[PDB]
A = this chain, B = another copy of it.
Amino acid sequence: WRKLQLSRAKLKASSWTSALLSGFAMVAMVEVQPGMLIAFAICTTLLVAVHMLALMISTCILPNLHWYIETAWAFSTLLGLILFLLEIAILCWVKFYDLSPPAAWSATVVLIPVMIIFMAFAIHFYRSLVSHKYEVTV
């Protein structure tokens, strides 16, 4: 029971953001329509693609290894999550590099602190977890 609730809630939660954030970003890109443009195209294309994985995983998990797909799901979500933040930075870039280049720097500069803590917080949480799997084993 406690295992079924953790799946049902998570299922809706994942589909929720993926579709929203993805669809939102797509609309954002086309809305604003030198070198950074090479990233804007890739950063966006990856976002939609990454989230799709999570969504397609939301379709395959219902019928059905559980600890394997569970990872593909979480990893996909996280990958897409960081990307969305990566997206906003690129936007400030292009959205400002035409009329106000000076302010744009702060956007990419302010991204650095947060991007680090993000991937960092994920590590600490994971490390403490592996320690438990071993602790319980002994």
Contacts and interface: CB of A to CB of B under 8 A. Distances in A.
Contacts of A11: 9, 13
Given A9-B62, A100-B37, A121-B72, A29 B95 contact: yes
Interface string A32-57: 11000111111011111110110110
A52 B9 CA distance: 18
12 contacts: A10-B59, A12-B12, A38-B102, A41-B103, A41-B110, A42-B103, A45-B85, A46-B114, A49-B118, A53-B118, A56-B81, A56-B122
B129 A84 contact: no
A73 to B, nearest CB: 9
Copies of this chain present: 6
Interface residues of A, number: 86
B27 A27 contact: yes
Contact of A58 (B13, B28, B41, B44): B13
Interface of A: 2, 4-6, 8-33, 37-42, 44-50, 52-53, 55-56, 58-60, 62-65, 69, 72, 74, 77-78, 81-82, 84-85, 87-89, 91-92, 95-96, 100, 102-104, 106-107, 110-111, 114-115, 118, 121-122, 125, 128-129
